[PDB]
Each structure stands twice: as C-alpha cells, then as structure tokens.
Amino acid sequence: FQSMTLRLYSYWRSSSAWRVRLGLALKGLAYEYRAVDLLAQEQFQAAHQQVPVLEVEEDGRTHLLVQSMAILEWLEERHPEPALLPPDLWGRARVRALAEHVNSGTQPMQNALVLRMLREKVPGWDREWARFFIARGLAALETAVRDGAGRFSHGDAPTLADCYLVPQLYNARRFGLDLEPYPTLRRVDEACAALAPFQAAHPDRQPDAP
Amino acid sequence: LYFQSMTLRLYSYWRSSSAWRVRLGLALKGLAYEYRAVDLLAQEQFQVPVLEVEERTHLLVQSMAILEWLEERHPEPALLPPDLWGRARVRALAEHVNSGTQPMQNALVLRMLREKVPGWDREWARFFIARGLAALETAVRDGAGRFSHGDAPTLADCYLVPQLYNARRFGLDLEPYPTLRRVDEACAALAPFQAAHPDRQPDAPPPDRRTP
Numbered sequence: 001f002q003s004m005t006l007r008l009y010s011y012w013r014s015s016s017a018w019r020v021r022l023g024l025a026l027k028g029l030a031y032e033y034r035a036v037d038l039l040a041q042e043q044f045q046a047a048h049q050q051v052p053v054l055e056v057e058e059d060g061r062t063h064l065l066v067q068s069m070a071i072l073e074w075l076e077e078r079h080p081e082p083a084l085l086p087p088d089l090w091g092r093a094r095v096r097a098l099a100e101h102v103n104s105g106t107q108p109m110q111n112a113l114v115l116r117m118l119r120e121k122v123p124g125w126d127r128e129w130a131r132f133f134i135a136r137g138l139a140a141l142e143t144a145v146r147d148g149a150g151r152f153s154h155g156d157a158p159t160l161a162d163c164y165l166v167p168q169l170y171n172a173r174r175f176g177l178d179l180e181p182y183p184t185l186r187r188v189d190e191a192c193a194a195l196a197p198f199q200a201a202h203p204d205r206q207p208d209a210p
Numbered sequence: 211l212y213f214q215s216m217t218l219r220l221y222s223y224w225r226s227s228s229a230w231r232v233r234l235g236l237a238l239k240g241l242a243y244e245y246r247a248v249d250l251l252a253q254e255q256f257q258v259p260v261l262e263v264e265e266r267t268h269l270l271v272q273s274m275a276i277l278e279w280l281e282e283r284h285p286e287p288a289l290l291p292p293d294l295w296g297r298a299r300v301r302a303l304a305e306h307v308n309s310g311t312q313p314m315q316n317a318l319v320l321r322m323l324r325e326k327v328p329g330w331d332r333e334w335a336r337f338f339i340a341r342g343l344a345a346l347e348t349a350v351r352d353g354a355g356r357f358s359h360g361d362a363p364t365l366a367d368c369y370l371v372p373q374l375y376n377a378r379r380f381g382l383d384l385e386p387y388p389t390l391r392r393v394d395e396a397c398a399a400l401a402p403f404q405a406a407h408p409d410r411q412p413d414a415p416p417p418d419r420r421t422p
Binding site for chain 2: 109111
C-alpha cells in the first residue's frame with residue numbers, strides 16, 4: 001500500500017504554477033516543491049524555435065498532471081473539502097467561465113514565447129501588446145466578476161476563480177497597468193491577500209524566489 | 211432546481227471553432243437546440259459561443275465552462291470518463307487547445323499582427339498551431355484508442371477536431387501528426403460530428419463566398 005504523494009514542479013514567478021499552488025494551499029495539501037530554472041529554459045527555447053507539473057504517486061503508479069485548469073479540477077474532485085467550486089450547476093459554470101477568462105482569454109497573450117516572438121519581430125511591441133491584452137482581459141473580467149462577487153469572485157468563499165484572478169493581477173502590475181478601473185477585482189484581491197493560503201502561495205514565499 | 215426541464219439556444223457563427231466545440235457537445239449528447247446566428251464577419255468589417263438556457267434565462271459563456279455544464283446536467287452519454295486520472299488527461303488535452311493553441315490564432319490577435327506586419331498573421335498562426343498539435347500528437351498517442359482518449363468520443367475530441375480544421379485553413383501540413391489525423395478520420399465518420407461541422411450550419415456561405 002502506497003498512500004498518495006504530491007510533488008509540484010514550479011517556478012516562483014510563474015502565474016500558471018501559482019494558480020496550482022493556490023489550489024494546494026487552499027485545500028491544506030502538503031507537497032514537495034521542485035524548482036525549475038525557467039529563465040535558463042526560456043533562453044534555450046528562444047534559440048530553438050513546462051510548469052506546472054503535478055506529479056502524483058499512489059499505489060506504486062506515477063501520474064504527471066499538466067494544465068493548470070485540469071490540475072485544479074483534479075484537486076477539486078480528489079480532495080473535495082474545502083470546496084473550490086460551488087455546489088450548484090449555475091455557480092459552477094460561472095466560476096469556470098471566470099477562470100477561463102484568465103486561463104484562455106488573458107494569460108496566453110502575455111506568454112513568454114508570444115512576447116518573445118513579437119519582440120524579435122518588432123522591438124518594444126511586446127510591451128504594448130501585453131498591456132493591451134491584459135487590460136482588455138481585466139476590463140471584461142471586472143464586469144463579469146462584479147455580477148456575482150461577494151467578498152470573493154463568487155460569493156463569500158474563495159473559488160477557482162480567485163486562483164486565476166490573483167496571479168493575473170500581479171502580472172498586470174509587472175507590466176505597469178493602472179488597476180484603478182477594476183475596483184471589484186482589487187477588492188477581491190485584497191480579501192484574498194489577507195488569507196494564509198494566499199500568502200503561502202505567493203511568488204516571494206517560494207523556495208526559488210531570489 | 212437545476213435539473214428541471216430546459217430549452218436551449220446557441221449563439222453561433224458557422225466558422226467559430228469555439229462555437230463548434232459546443233455544437234459537438236450538444237450533438238454528442240443528443241440535445242436539440244435553436245441556432246441563433248451571429249455574423250462575426252459583418253460585425254467586424256463594419257459574444258460567441260453563448261448557450262442560452264431557458265426554463266427565466268441563464269447565459270452560459272466560455273466553451274469549457276459550457277461543456278462542463280452539459281456534462282453535469284446531462285451525464286449520459288459521458289464526454290468525461292468516471293476515473294479521476296482519465297478526467298485529468300481529457301481536460302489537459304482540451305486545455306492544450308483551449309488555452310494553449312486557439313488563443314494564439316483568434317481573430318483579434320491575427321488582425322493586430324497583420325496590421326503591424328502584413329502577411330505575418332498566417333505565419334504566426336502556423337507556428338503556434340503546429341506547436342500545439344505537436345504536443346497533442348504526443349499527449350494523445352499515450353492513451354488514445356480510436357479517439358483522443360480511449361475508444362469513444364470525449365471532450366478532448368470536441369477541441370481537437372475544430373483545431374485541425376483551422377490548421378488546414380492556414381495551410382499547415384498535417385503529415386507530422388498521424389495519430390491526430392486518424393482520430394480526426396474516426397470522428398468525421400460519426401453523425402454528430404457531421405452535424406456540427408461548419409458546412410452544415412444555417413449561416414454557412416457557399417464555398418465561393420468564403421474567405422481564407
């Protein structure tokens with residue numbers, strides 16, 4: 001008998017990895033942190049045309065789970081409490097949509113490879129592009145979150161939606177975006193920041209934070 | 211009471227890959243729906259998909275959220291397996307497309323690319339689609355039977371099929387993805403896939419009035 005073990009391949013500043021760190025922390029799940037040298041990896045990838053990976057061992061078999069949303073859905077199914085999705089069908093669809101706004105609708109357009117391609121083609125274009133797409137994504141997210149937010153993105157408890165929102169706002173700040181136009185997002189971000197699991201998952205608390 | 215009887219209306223554009231995913235979920239579950247055409251081209255030259263659920267009105271958005279709702283509300287036939295590992299694999303295959311491939315070739319992205327550099331949007335699309343399909347080919351190859359996951363259609367095929375159509379649109383050579391081609395062929399022979407294809411949609415133009 002081999003009871004389940006968790007290992008996360010992570011980079012301190014990766015928003016994708018951070019989402020999964022939030023799911024793990026909110027669920028009270030311990031895991032081995034395995035740092036990936038993402039800056040070296042990206043330099044190599046650049047010259048030649050990834051995290052998170054959640055490695056799970058149980059009963060002598062190993063599973064390598066990838067894609068933040070798939071990993072988070074697995075955490076929610078495998079370890080139900082505390083719940084990061086609401087119990088009702090409508091609320092679940094809303095929370096998944098908020099998460100996907102970020103997962104598919106905002107973050108990909110500020111992918112390191114995307115920005116690198118833009119920068120190699122036209123220097124500086126990468127910054128303009130990231131700012132445009134992140135602001136666009138946040139404007140749409142602000143509207144959607146406002147219609148249904150309580151203390152958090154959905155009602156009065158953290159959900160998968162907050163796990164996507166928080167790292168995306170950090171990236172927005174990195175690109176120098178004014179967050180004043182997203183008051184609901186800022187309020188929710190502040191509520192999350194006061195929670196111990198959010199503090200634990202933050203880039204600055206990770207073993208590979210320089 | 212979220213399992214009461216309902217009526218469905220899909221806001222769709224014939225060529226929208228995101229809408230196509232939802233059309234596939236509906237067809238595979240045998241669910242009738244009203245087609246509400248949204249002319250994305252007319253409304254460009256001058257939101258899709260939205261699944262409107264009526265019983266009071268709920269507007270469901272984002273292809274993956276809509277498909278997960280369909281799977282919860284109408285569990286049979288299942289487009290996610292019952293085992294948790296298989297669910298994670300299927301969702302990962304879906305997300306490789308949903309977040310890892312399609313966003314890099316969406317309409318606004320392509321437009322802004324060719325606005326700053328003419329011609330480059332199609333080279334870019336081919337680069338990112340190829341990148342995505344290469345990952346899929348390998349991830350699918352470990353666990354595919356006749357389809358992306360095992361021997362029956364799942365959510366993974368709902369994402370794969372429209373993405374391969376877009377690959378062809380952009381003139382990407384599909385020879386390096388033999389597993390994906392075989393899965394595409396298996397899906398294409400099924401009635402629900404035939405029903406959901408762009409060419410069969412109410413707003414589809416004839417071939418001679420289509421853009422590349």
